[PDB]
Design a protein around this ligand. Structure first.
Ligand SMILES: CC(C)CCC[C@@H](C)[C@H]1CC[C@H]2[C@@H]3CC=C4C[C@@H](O)CC[C@]4(C)[C@H]3CC[C@]12C
Ligand SMILES: CC(C)CCC[C@@H](C)[C@H]1CC[C@H]2[C@@H]3CC=C4C[C@@H](O)CC[C@]4(C)[C@H]3CC[C@]12C
Ligand SMILES: CC(C)CCC[C@@H](C)[C@H]1CC[C@H]2[C@@H]3CC=C4C[C@@H](O)CC[C@]4(C)[C@H]3CC[C@]12C
Ligand SMILES: CC(C)(C)CC(=O)Nc1c(F)cc(C(=O)Nc2nccs2)cc1F
Ligand SMILES: CCCCCCCC/C=C\CCCCCCCC(=O)O
Ligand SMILES: CCCCCCCC/C=C\CCCCCCCC(=O)O
Ligand code: NA
Length: 386
Protein backbone atom coordinates (compact mmCIF):
# COMPACT_ATOMS: atom_id res chain seq x y z
CA UNK A 1 0.00 0.00 0.00
CA UNK A 2 1.13 3.59 -0.57
CA UNK A 3 2.72 5.17 2.51
CA UNK A 4 0.64 8.35 2.18
CA UNK A 5 -2.66 6.52 2.76
CA UNK A 6 -1.65 5.28 6.21
CA UNK A 7 -0.15 8.72 6.82
CA UNK A 8 -3.46 10.43 5.96
CA UNK A 9 -5.12 8.93 9.04
CA UNK A 10 -2.21 10.04 11.24
CA UNK A 11 -2.12 13.66 10.02
CA UNK A 12 -5.90 14.04 10.31
CA UNK A 13 -5.92 12.71 13.89
CA UNK A 14 -2.89 14.87 14.72
CA UNK A 15 -4.68 18.00 13.52
CA UNK A 16 -7.91 17.05 15.30
CA UNK A 17 -5.94 16.79 18.54
CA UNK A 18 -4.32 20.17 17.84
CA UNK A 19 -7.71 21.87 17.46
CA UNK A 20 -8.98 20.53 20.78
CA UNK A 21 -5.65 21.39 22.42
CA UNK A 22 -5.81 25.06 21.42
CA UNK A 23 -9.53 25.61 22.08
CA UNK A 24 -9.72 23.81 25.41
CA UNK A 25 -6.67 25.40 27.00
CA UNK A 26 -7.45 28.89 25.69
CA UNK A 27 -10.81 28.52 27.45
CA UNK A 28 -8.93 27.80 30.69
CA UNK A 29 -6.74 30.91 30.46
CA UNK A 30 -9.73 33.11 29.61
CA UNK A 31 -11.57 31.82 32.69
CA UNK A 32 -8.63 32.64 34.97
CA UNK A 33 -8.43 36.10 33.40
CA UNK A 34 -12.08 36.94 34.12
CA UNK A 35 -12.86 35.30 37.45
CA UNK A 36 -11.39 36.95 40.54
CA UNK A 37 -11.72 33.75 42.59
CA UNK A 38 -9.72 31.73 40.05
CA UNK A 39 -6.77 34.13 40.51
CA UNK A 40 -4.48 32.51 43.06
CA UNK A 41 -1.10 30.79 43.26
CA UNK A 42 -2.40 27.30 42.49
CA UNK A 43 -4.13 28.43 39.29
CA UNK A 44 -1.02 30.26 38.05
CA UNK A 45 0.70 26.89 37.69
CA UNK A 46 -2.51 25.70 36.01
CA UNK A 47 -2.13 28.49 33.44
CA UNK A 48 1.57 27.67 33.07
CA UNK A 49 0.34 24.13 32.37
CA UNK A 50 -2.26 25.19 29.78
CA UNK A 51 0.41 27.48 28.30
CA UNK A 52 2.50 24.47 27.27
CA UNK A 53 -0.62 22.60 26.09
CA UNK A 54 -1.49 25.38 23.63
CA UNK A 55 2.11 25.38 22.35
CA UNK A 56 1.75 21.65 21.61
CA UNK A 57 -1.02 22.20 19.07
CA UNK A 58 0.55 25.34 17.62
CA UNK A 59 4.14 24.07 17.28
CA UNK A 60 4.78 20.54 18.56
CA UNK A 61 1.97 18.82 16.60
CA UNK A 62 2.89 20.64 13.35
CA UNK A 63 6.52 19.69 14.07
CA UNK A 64 5.56 16.02 14.56
CA UNK A 65 3.83 15.98 11.16
CA UNK A 66 6.90 17.49 9.49
CA UNK A 67 9.25 14.89 10.99
CA UNK A 68 6.99 12.09 9.69
CA UNK A 69 7.79 13.08 6.09
CA UNK A 70 11.56 12.66 6.50
CA UNK A 71 12.20 15.91 4.63
CA UNK A 72 15.74 17.04 3.87
CA UNK A 73 17.16 19.48 6.42
CA UNK A 74 20.36 20.44 8.20
CA UNK A 75 21.00 18.16 11.16
CA UNK A 76 20.67 20.96 13.74
CA UNK A 77 17.49 22.32 12.15
CA UNK A 78 16.02 18.82 12.33
CA UNK A 79 17.40 18.62 15.88
CA UNK A 80 15.44 21.66 17.09
CA UNK A 81 12.05 20.59 15.72
CA UNK A 82 12.52 17.11 17.21
CA UNK A 83 13.63 18.36 20.64
CA UNK A 84 11.14 21.20 21.09
CA UNK A 85 8.46 18.80 22.34
CA UNK A 86 10.92 17.77 25.06
CA UNK A 87 10.93 21.36 26.31
CA UNK A 88 7.13 21.43 26.64
CA UNK A 89 7.06 18.03 28.36
CA UNK A 90 9.64 19.20 30.91
CA UNK A 91 7.64 22.40 31.44
CA UNK A 92 4.58 20.32 32.34
CA UNK A 93 6.53 18.16 34.79
CA UNK A 94 7.78 21.22 36.67
CA UNK A 95 4.25 22.69 36.73
CA UNK A 96 2.67 19.48 38.03
CA UNK A 97 5.40 19.19 40.66
CA UNK A 98 4.72 22.76 41.80
CA UNK A 99 0.99 22.13 42.22
CA UNK A 100 1.65 19.10 44.45
CA UNK A 101 3.98 21.14 46.67
CA UNK A 102 1.45 23.99 46.76
CA UNK A 103 -1.39 21.72 47.92
CA UNK A 104 1.01 20.08 50.38
CA UNK A 105 1.88 23.44 51.96
CA UNK A 106 -1.79 24.45 52.23
CA UNK A 107 -2.67 21.30 54.18
CA UNK A 108 0.50 20.96 56.30
CA UNK A 109 0.89 24.53 57.58
CA UNK A 110 -2.41 26.33 56.87
CA UNK A 111 -1.61 29.27 59.18
CA UNK A 112 1.67 29.89 57.32
CA UNK A 113 0.59 29.44 53.68
CA UNK A 114 -0.25 33.10 53.06
CA UNK A 115 3.06 34.12 54.63
CA UNK A 116 5.01 31.55 52.62
CA UNK A 117 3.70 31.78 49.04
CA UNK A 118 2.63 34.92 47.16
CA UNK A 119 1.87 36.04 43.62
CA UNK A 120 5.25 37.57 42.80
CA UNK A 121 7.17 34.62 44.26
CA UNK A 122 5.10 32.18 42.19
CA UNK A 123 5.57 34.20 38.99
CA UNK A 124 9.34 33.91 39.42
CA UNK A 125 9.18 30.14 39.88
CA UNK A 126 7.30 29.81 36.58
CA UNK A 127 10.11 31.71 34.83
CA UNK A 128 12.82 29.53 36.41
CA UNK A 129 11.07 26.31 35.40
CA UNK A 130 10.53 27.48 31.82
CA UNK A 131 14.20 28.47 31.47
CA UNK A 132 15.23 25.08 32.86
CA UNK A 133 12.73 23.39 30.54
CA UNK A 134 14.49 24.89 27.52
CA UNK A 135 17.89 23.88 28.91
CA UNK A 136 16.92 20.26 29.57
CA UNK A 137 14.83 19.87 26.42
CA UNK A 138 17.58 21.28 24.20
CA UNK A 139 20.57 19.49 25.72
CA UNK A 140 21.18 17.51 22.47
CA UNK A 141 21.59 20.87 20.70
CA UNK A 142 24.72 21.52 22.77
CA UNK A 143 26.59 18.61 21.17
CA UNK A 144 24.94 15.43 22.45
CA UNK A 145 23.54 14.48 19.05
CA UNK A 146 24.07 12.07 16.17
CA UNK A 147 25.01 14.76 13.64
CA UNK A 148 28.63 13.54 13.66
CA UNK A 149 27.50 10.15 12.30
CA UNK A 150 24.76 10.91 9.76
CA UNK A 151 22.91 8.28 7.74
CA UNK A 152 24.30 9.03 4.28
CA UNK A 153 22.53 6.20 2.43
CA UNK A 154 19.17 7.47 3.65
CA UNK A 155 20.15 11.03 2.70
CA UNK A 156 21.13 10.31 -0.91
CA UNK A 157 18.03 8.13 -1.26
CA UNK A 158 15.86 11.26 -0.97
CA UNK A 159 18.51 13.45 -2.62
CA UNK A 160 19.39 15.74 0.28
CA UNK A 161 22.14 18.29 -0.28
CA UNK A 162 25.50 18.34 1.44
CA UNK A 163 25.05 18.81 5.18
CA UNK A 164 21.36 17.85 4.96
CA UNK A 165 19.98 14.64 6.47
CA UNK A 166 16.73 12.70 6.28
CA UNK A 167 14.94 14.20 9.28
CA UNK A 168 13.86 11.46 11.70
CA UNK A 169 13.65 11.50 15.48
CA UNK A 170 15.61 8.31 16.18
CA UNK A 171 18.21 9.41 13.60
CA UNK A 172 19.31 12.63 15.32
CA UNK A 173 18.43 12.21 19.02
CA UNK A 174 20.60 9.66 20.87
CA UNK A 175 18.62 6.98 22.69
CA UNK A 176 20.85 7.13 25.79
CA UNK A 177 19.80 10.75 26.28
CA UNK A 178 16.17 9.68 25.91
CA UNK A 179 16.41 6.76 28.35
CA UNK A 180 18.92 7.80 31.02
CA UNK A 181 18.83 11.60 30.88
CA UNK A 182 15.26 12.31 29.76
CA UNK A 183 13.21 9.35 31.00
CA UNK A 184 14.94 8.20 34.18
CA UNK A 185 16.31 11.44 35.61
CA UNK A 186 14.02 14.13 34.22
CA UNK A 187 10.70 12.25 33.92
CA UNK A 188 10.63 9.18 36.19
CA UNK A 189 12.35 10.82 39.19
CA UNK A 190 9.96 13.81 39.42
CA UNK A 191 6.96 11.51 38.86
CA UNK A 192 8.01 9.27 41.75
CA UNK A 193 8.46 12.43 43.83
CA UNK A 194 4.87 13.51 43.14
CA UNK A 195 3.66 10.09 44.30
CA UNK A 196 5.49 10.59 47.59
CA UNK A 197 4.18 14.14 47.93
CA UNK A 198 0.58 13.09 47.36
CA UNK A 199 1.02 10.19 49.80
CA UNK A 200 1.98 12.64 52.54
CA UNK A 201 -0.92 14.91 51.51
CA UNK A 202 -3.53 12.18 51.98
CA UNK A 203 -1.78 10.94 55.14
CA UNK A 204 -1.67 14.31 56.93
CA UNK A 205 -5.25 15.08 55.84
CA UNK A 206 -6.84 11.98 57.37
CA UNK A 207 -4.74 12.15 60.55
CA UNK A 208 -6.17 15.58 61.39
CA UNK A 209 -9.72 14.29 60.86
CA UNK A 210 -8.44 10.98 63.86
CA UNK A 211 -7.63 14.20 65.72
CA UNK A 212 -10.97 15.91 65.11
CA UNK A 213 -13.00 12.89 66.20
CA UNK A 214 -10.65 12.19 69.12
CA UNK A 215 -11.15 15.57 70.79
CA UNK A 216 -14.87 15.23 70.06
CA UNK A 217 -14.83 11.90 71.93
CA UNK A 218 -12.66 13.30 74.73
CA UNK A 219 -15.31 16.01 75.16
CA UNK A 220 -18.27 13.60 75.13
CA UNK A 221 -16.96 10.60 77.08
CA UNK A 222 -15.69 12.66 80.02
CA UNK A 223 -19.10 14.33 80.33
CA UNK A 224 -20.54 10.92 81.23
CA UNK A 225 -17.69 10.52 83.74
CA UNK A 226 -19.01 13.62 85.53
CA UNK A 227 -22.65 12.45 85.31
CA UNK A 228 -21.95 9.27 87.33
CA UNK A 229 -18.98 10.37 89.47
CA UNK A 230 -18.78 9.65 93.20
CA UNK A 231 -16.19 12.07 94.64
CA UNK A 232 -14.87 15.54 93.89
CA UNK A 233 -11.57 14.15 92.58
CA UNK A 234 -13.23 12.07 89.84
CA UNK A 235 -14.86 15.19 88.41
CA UNK A 236 -11.40 16.81 88.40
CA UNK A 237 -9.83 14.04 86.30
CA UNK A 238 -12.69 14.32 83.79
CA UNK A 239 -12.66 18.14 83.60
CA UNK A 240 -8.88 18.45 83.26
CA UNK A 241 -8.90 16.07 80.28
CA UNK A 242 -11.69 18.12 78.68
CA UNK A 243 -9.88 21.40 79.35
CA UNK A 244 -6.74 20.18 77.56
CA UNK A 245 -8.88 18.80 74.72
CA UNK A 246 -10.77 22.11 74.43
CA UNK A 247 -7.50 24.02 74.04
CA UNK A 248 -6.23 21.40 71.57
CA UNK A 249 -9.28 21.55 69.28
CA UNK A 250 -9.00 25.28 68.53
CA UNK A 251 -5.38 25.06 67.31
CA UNK A 252 -14.88 36.01 66.21
CA UNK A 253 -17.61 33.37 66.38
CA UNK A 254 -14.85 30.76 66.68
CA UNK A 255 -13.12 32.50 69.60
CA UNK A 256 -16.28 33.32 71.58
CA UNK A 257 -17.42 29.69 71.37
CA UNK A 258 -14.44 28.46 73.38
CA UNK A 259 -14.63 31.53 75.65
CA UNK A 260 -17.86 30.13 77.09
CA UNK A 261 -16.79 26.47 76.98
CA UNK A 262 -13.35 26.74 78.58
CA UNK A 263 -14.74 29.28 81.06
CA UNK A 264 -17.55 26.96 82.14
CA UNK A 265 -14.95 24.22 82.63
CA UNK A 266 -13.10 26.52 85.04
CA UNK A 267 -16.41 27.34 86.74
CA UNK A 268 -16.85 23.64 87.53
CA UNK A 269 -13.12 23.01 88.04
CA UNK A 270 -12.86 25.49 90.92
CA UNK A 271 -15.95 23.94 92.53
CA UNK A 272 -14.22 20.54 92.35
CA UNK A 273 -11.02 21.75 94.06
CA UNK A 274 -13.15 23.10 96.92
CA UNK A 275 -14.75 19.66 97.37
CA UNK A 276 -18.31 20.60 96.37
CA UNK A 277 -19.29 17.56 94.31
CA UNK A 278 -22.91 18.26 93.35
CA UNK A 279 -22.44 21.91 92.37
CA UNK A 280 -19.55 20.84 90.12
CA UNK A 281 -21.71 18.20 88.42
CA UNK A 282 -24.35 20.88 87.73
CA UNK A 283 -21.85 23.43 86.40
CA UNK A 284 -20.52 20.79 83.98
CA UNK A 285 -24.05 20.19 82.64
CA UNK A 286 -24.06 23.73 81.23
CA UNK A 287 -21.34 22.58 78.82
CA UNK A 288 -23.84 20.52 76.81
CA UNK A 289 -25.87 23.51 75.61
CA UNK A 290 -22.65 25.35 74.77
CA UNK A 291 -21.55 22.25 72.84
CA UNK A 292 -24.72 22.12 70.71
CA UNK A 293 -24.49 25.83 69.81
CA UNK A 294 -20.78 26.50 69.15
CA UNK A 295 -18.59 23.41 69.33
CA UNK A 296 -20.53 21.21 66.90
CA UNK A 297 -20.47 24.14 64.47
CA UNK A 298 -16.66 24.09 64.44
CA UNK A 299 -16.23 20.27 64.56
CA UNK A 300 -18.58 20.69 61.27
CA UNK A 301 -16.86 23.59 59.53
CA UNK A 302 -13.47 21.94 60.04
CA UNK A 303 -14.68 18.70 58.44
CA UNK A 304 -16.06 20.69 55.50
CA UNK A 305 -12.84 22.64 54.85
CA UNK A 306 -10.64 19.54 55.10
CA UNK A 307 -12.89 17.64 52.70
CA UNK A 308 -12.74 20.45 50.12
CA UNK A 309 -8.94 20.45 50.32
CA UNK A 310 -8.90 16.67 49.78
CA UNK A 311 -11.22 17.09 46.78
CA UNK A 312 -8.76 19.62 45.34
CA UNK A 313 -5.79 17.31 45.97
CA UNK A 314 -7.63 14.38 44.36
CA UNK A 315 -8.35 16.53 41.29
CA UNK A 316 -4.71 17.61 41.03
CA UNK A 317 -3.49 14.02 41.48
CA UNK A 318 -5.61 12.94 38.50
CA UNK A 319 -3.80 15.46 36.27
CA UNK A 320 -0.45 13.91 37.21
CA UNK A 321 -1.87 10.40 36.73
CA UNK A 322 -3.17 11.20 33.26
CA UNK A 323 0.23 12.68 32.39
CA UNK A 324 1.98 9.45 33.38
CA UNK A 325 -0.49 7.21 31.54
CA UNK A 326 -0.28 9.23 28.31
CA UNK A 327 3.52 9.43 28.05
CA UNK A 328 4.81 6.13 29.44
CA UNK A 329 4.01 3.99 26.35
CA UNK A 330 6.11 6.33 24.18
CA UNK A 331 8.92 6.12 26.75
CA UNK A 332 8.84 2.32 27.14
CA UNK A 333 9.15 1.94 23.36
CA UNK A 334 12.34 4.00 23.71
CA UNK A 335 13.46 1.58 26.44
CA UNK A 336 12.88 -1.39 24.12
CA UNK A 337 14.66 0.23 21.17
CA UNK A 338 17.65 1.06 23.38
CA UNK A 339 18.01 -1.90 25.74
CA UNK A 340 16.98 -4.77 23.46
CA UNK A 341 18.87 -4.86 20.13
CA UNK A 342 17.66 -8.41 19.43
CA UNK A 343 14.05 -7.20 19.54
CA UNK A 344 12.48 -6.10 16.27
CA UNK A 345 11.75 -2.37 16.29
CA UNK A 346 8.22 -1.31 17.16
CA UNK A 347 6.05 -1.15 14.01
CA UNK A 348 5.03 2.14 12.44
CA UNK A 349 1.35 1.85 13.35
CA UNK A 350 2.27 1.50 17.03
CA UNK A 351 4.64 4.48 16.85
CA UNK A 352 1.81 6.55 15.37
CA UNK A 353 -0.51 5.36 18.15
CA UNK A 354 2.02 6.24 20.88
CA UNK A 355 2.66 9.75 19.54
CA UNK A 356 -1.02 10.69 19.37
CA UNK A 357 -1.53 9.20 22.84
CA UNK A 358 1.20 11.47 24.19
CA UNK A 359 -0.44 14.44 22.45
CA UNK A 360 -3.89 13.65 23.86
CA UNK A 361 -2.71 14.83 27.30
CA UNK A 362 -3.12 18.41 26.02
CA UNK A 363 -6.87 17.91 25.56
CA UNK A 364 -7.63 15.93 28.73
CA UNK A 365 -6.79 18.72 31.19
CA UNK A 366 -9.70 21.17 30.63
CA UNK A 367 -12.22 18.33 30.92
CA UNK A 368 -10.97 17.49 34.42
CA UNK A 369 -11.26 21.04 35.77
CA UNK A 370 -14.87 21.26 34.56
CA UNK A 371 -15.87 17.85 35.96
CA UNK A 372 -14.08 18.29 39.30
CA UNK A 373 -13.78 22.01 40.12
CA UNK A 374 -17.07 23.83 40.61
CA UNK A 375 -15.66 27.35 40.19
CA UNK A 376 -14.11 26.44 36.83
CA UNK A 377 -17.31 24.75 35.62
CA UNK A 378 -19.47 27.80 36.35
CA UNK A 379 -16.97 30.15 34.70
CA UNK A 380 -16.89 28.08 31.50
CA UNK A 381 -20.67 28.36 31.13
CA UNK A 382 -20.69 32.17 31.11
CA UNK A 383 -17.94 32.32 28.48
CA UNK A 384 -19.82 29.85 26.26
CA UNK A 385 -23.16 31.65 26.69
CA UNK A 386 -21.87 35.12 25.82
C1 LIG B 1 6.41 30.62 16.65
C2 LIG B 1 6.91 30.40 15.22
C3 LIG B 1 5.94 31.12 14.29
C4 LIG B 1 8.34 30.92 15.07
C5 LIG B 1 9.18 30.21 13.99
C6 LIG B 1 9.76 28.83 14.38
C7 LIG B 1 9.90 27.90 13.20
C8 LIG B 1 8.69 28.05 12.27
C9 LIG B 1 11.31 28.10 12.57
C10 LIG B 1 12.46 28.65 13.42
C11 LIG B 1 13.69 27.76 13.25
C12 LIG B 1 13.38 27.14 11.97
C13 LIG B 1 14.24 26.04 11.63
C14 LIG B 1 15.40 26.78 11.14
C15 LIG B 1 16.34 25.70 10.59
C16 LIG B 1 15.88 24.88 9.68
C17 LIG B 1 16.94 24.06 8.82
C18 LIG B 1 16.42 23.85 7.39
O1 LIG B 1 17.04 22.77 6.66
C19 LIG B 1 14.94 23.53 7.34
C20 LIG B 1 14.05 24.48 8.14
C21 LIG B 1 14.42 24.62 9.62
C22 LIG B 1 14.30 23.34 10.45
C23 LIG B 1 13.59 25.74 10.36
C24 LIG B 1 12.25 25.27 10.74
C25 LIG B 1 11.33 26.44 11.00
C26 LIG B 1 11.93 26.82 12.25
C27 LIG B 1 11.68 25.75 13.34
C1 LIG C 1 6.84 3.47 36.87
C2 LIG C 1 8.20 2.94 36.43
C3 LIG C 1 8.83 2.14 37.58
C4 LIG C 1 8.07 2.18 35.10
C5 LIG C 1 9.19 1.17 34.77
C6 LIG C 1 9.64 1.15 33.30
C7 LIG C 1 10.94 0.40 33.09
C8 LIG C 1 11.92 0.68 34.23
C9 LIG C 1 10.68 -1.11 32.81
C10 LIG C 1 9.31 -1.76 32.61
C11 LIG C 1 9.33 -2.59 31.33
C12 LIG C 1 10.76 -2.87 31.28
C13 LIG C 1 11.21 -3.46 30.06
C14 LIG C 1 10.85 -4.85 30.30
C15 LIG C 1 11.42 -5.59 29.09
C16 LIG C 1 12.67 -5.43 28.76
C17 LIG C 1 13.28 -6.49 27.74
C18 LIG C 1 14.76 -6.78 28.02
O1 LIG C 1 15.48 -7.31 26.89
C19 LIG C 1 15.52 -5.53 28.37
C20 LIG C 1 14.80 -4.71 29.48
C21 LIG C 1 13.37 -4.21 29.21
C22 LIG C 1 13.18 -3.35 27.96
C23 LIG C 1 12.62 -3.51 30.42
C24 LIG C 1 13.04 -2.12 30.53
C25 LIG C 1 12.62 -1.48 31.79
C26 LIG C 1 11.23 -1.44 31.49
C27 LIG C 1 10.97 -0.37 30.41
C1 LIG D 1 2.22 1.52 31.41
C2 LIG D 1 1.13 1.01 30.46
C3 LIG D 1 0.42 2.18 29.78
C4 LIG D 1 1.65 -0.09 29.51
C5 LIG D 1 1.68 0.22 27.99
C6 LIG D 1 2.11 -0.97 27.11
C7 LIG D 1 3.43 -0.87 26.36
C8 LIG D 1 4.43 0.03 27.11
C9 LIG D 1 3.96 -2.29 26.00
C10 LIG D 1 3.02 -3.49 25.84
C11 LIG D 1 3.33 -4.30 24.59
C12 LIG D 1 4.69 -3.83 24.43
C13 LIG D 1 5.23 -4.21 23.18
C14 LIG D 1 5.64 -5.57 23.49
C15 LIG D 1 6.19 -6.06 22.18
C16 LIG D 1 6.95 -5.27 21.45
C17 LIG D 1 7.65 -5.83 20.13
C18 LIG D 1 9.17 -5.79 20.36
O1 LIG D 1 10.02 -5.99 19.21
C19 LIG D 1 9.60 -4.44 20.91
C20 LIG D 1 8.78 -3.93 22.10
C21 LIG D 1 7.27 -3.90 21.96
C22 LIG D 1 6.76 -2.91 20.92
C23 LIG D 1 6.55 -3.59 23.32
C24 LIG D 1 6.30 -2.16 23.48
C25 LIG D 1 5.72 -1.73 24.74
C26 LIG D 1 4.44 -2.34 24.63
C27 LIG D 1 3.52 -1.55 23.65
C1 LIG E 1 7.20 8.64 12.36
C2 LIG E 1 8.65 8.72 11.79
C3 LIG E 1 9.52 7.60 12.44
C4 LIG E 1 8.58 8.50 10.22
C5 LIG E 1 9.25 10.13 12.06
C6 LIG E 1 9.45 10.37 13.58
O1 LIG E 1 10.48 10.12 14.09
N1 LIG E 1 8.31 10.91 14.39
C7 LIG E 1 8.44 11.14 15.83
C8 LIG E 1 8.14 12.40 16.35
F1 LIG E 1 7.74 13.39 15.54
C9 LIG E 1 8.26 12.62 17.72
C10 LIG E 1 8.67 11.60 18.55
C11 LIG E 1 8.78 11.86 20.09
O2 LIG E 1 8.37 12.91 20.52
N2 LIG E 1 9.32 10.85 20.96
C12 LIG E 1 9.44 11.00 22.41
N3 LIG E 1 9.82 9.97 23.30
C13 LIG E 1 9.80 10.53 24.75
C14 LIG E 1 9.42 11.90 24.70
S1 LIG E 1 9.17 12.25 23.26
C15 LIG E 1 8.96 10.34 18.05
C16 LIG E 1 8.84 10.11 16.67
F2 LIG E 1 9.14 8.87 16.17
C1 LIG F 1 -6.95 7.29 21.98
C2 LIG F 1 -6.45 7.23 20.54
C3 LIG F 1 -7.13 8.28 19.67
C4 LIG F 1 -8.07 7.61 18.67
C5 LIG F 1 -7.65 7.90 17.23
C6 LIG F 1 -6.77 6.77 16.70
C7 LIG F 1 -6.53 6.97 15.22
C8 LIG F 1 -5.36 6.75 14.61
C9 LIG F 1 -4.13 6.28 15.36
C10 LIG F 1 -2.94 6.30 14.40
C11 LIG F 1 -3.04 5.19 13.35
C12 LIG F 1 -2.32 5.61 12.08
C13 LIG F 1 -2.69 4.72 10.90
C14 LIG F 1 -1.58 3.72 10.61
C15 LIG F 1 -1.83 3.04 9.27
C16 LIG F 1 -3.11 2.22 9.29
O1 LIG F 1 -3.35 1.49 10.28
O2 LIG F 1 -3.90 2.32 8.32
C1 LIG G 1 -3.23 25.81 14.65
C2 LIG G 1 -3.89 24.47 14.40
C3 LIG G 1 -3.14 23.60 13.39
C4 LIG G 1 -3.19 24.19 11.99
C5 LIG G 1 -1.80 24.67 11.58
C6 LIG G 1 -1.43 24.08 10.23
C7 LIG G 1 -0.67 22.78 10.44
C8 LIG G 1 0.04 22.47 9.14
C9 LIG G 1 0.62 21.07 9.13
C10 LIG G 1 1.85 20.78 8.71
C11 LIG G 1 2.78 21.85 8.19
C12 LIG G 1 3.96 21.19 7.53
C13 LIG G 1 3.51 20.20 6.47
C14 LIG G 1 4.70 19.40 5.97
C15 LIG G 1 5.77 20.33 5.42
C16 LIG G 1 6.89 19.53 4.80
C17 LIG G 1 6.48 19.03 3.42
C18 LIG G 1 7.67 18.73 2.55
O1 LIG G 1 8.63 19.54 2.55
O2 LIG G 1 7.66 17.70 1.84
NA1 NA H 1 1.16 18.53 28.33
Amino acid sequence: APPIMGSSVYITVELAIAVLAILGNVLVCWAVWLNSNLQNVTNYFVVSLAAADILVGVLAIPFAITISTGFCAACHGCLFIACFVLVLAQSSIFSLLAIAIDRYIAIAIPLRYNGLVTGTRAAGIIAICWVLSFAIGLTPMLGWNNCGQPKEGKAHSQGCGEGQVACLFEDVVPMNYMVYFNFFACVLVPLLLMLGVYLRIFAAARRQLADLEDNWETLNDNLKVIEKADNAAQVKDALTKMRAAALDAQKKDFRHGFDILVGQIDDALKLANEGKVKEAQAAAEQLKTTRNAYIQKYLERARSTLQKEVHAAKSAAIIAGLFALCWLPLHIINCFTFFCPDCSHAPLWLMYLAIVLAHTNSVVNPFIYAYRIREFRQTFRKIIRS
